[PDB]
């Protein structure tokens, strides 16, 4: 399993100890408060009022928690995944990432605490 924090200002994301393999069932639970710039902070679902100005994940709000599995595109995690199975031919190490616009991570603050584990399958 993996337990740690994902820094909002870390554009390269947070590499976990989870290597997603075909058929794996995983659970993720994310918590905490972060910001993509403003003094206000948002949870793992991000800011539902802020327009997408070029986010790394166009399927989640700005400031939401997202992930990459191997060399995959960004996949929304938000508050978490419940006994989740990846799309076909998606595999590799899970990288957790704060959802923001490329080049604009420098002014981000806070972090999400996250747990990831592989489930019975």
Q: Which residues bind ligand GAL (CB under 6 A)?
A: 36-37, 53, 62, 100-101, 104, 107
- Rule CB under 5 A: choose which of 10, 27, 72, 104 binds Ca ion: 104
Write down the least CB distance from residue 69 to ligand GAL, Å.
24
Burial class (CB in 10 A: 0-12, 13-18, 19+), 89: exposed
Q: Tell which residue, 94, 102, 97, has the closest CA to residue 71.
A: 94
Distances (CA, A) of 69 to 17, 41, 86, 90: 12, 27, 9, 7
Select the binding partner of residue 62 from Ca ion, ligand GAL, none (C-beta < 5 to 8 A, by kind).
ligand GAL
Question: Toward ligand GAL, which CB reaches closer, 87 or 103?
Answer: 103
Write down the least CB distance from residue 31 to ligand GAL, Å.
21
Q: What angle do CA 21, 95, 107 make, to 5 degrees?
A: 170
Question: Toward Ca ion, which CB reaches closer, 17 or 107?
Answer: 107
């Amino acid at each position: 399993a993996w337990k740690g924090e994902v820094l909002a200002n870390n554009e390269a994301g947070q590499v976990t100890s989870i290597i997603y393999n075909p058929g794996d069932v995983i659970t993720i639970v994310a918590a905490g408060w972060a910001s993509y710039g403003p003094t206000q902070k948002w949870g793992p679902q991000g800011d539902r009022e802020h327009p997408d100005q070029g986010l790394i994940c166009h399927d989640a709000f700005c400031g939401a928690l997202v992930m990459k599995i191997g060399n995959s595109g960004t996949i929304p995690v938000n508050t978490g995944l419940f006994r989740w199975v990846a799309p076909n031919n998606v595999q590799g190490a899970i990288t957790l990432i704060y959802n923001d616009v490329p080049g604009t991570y420098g002014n981000n603050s806070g972090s999400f605490s996250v747990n990831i584990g592989k489930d019975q399958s």
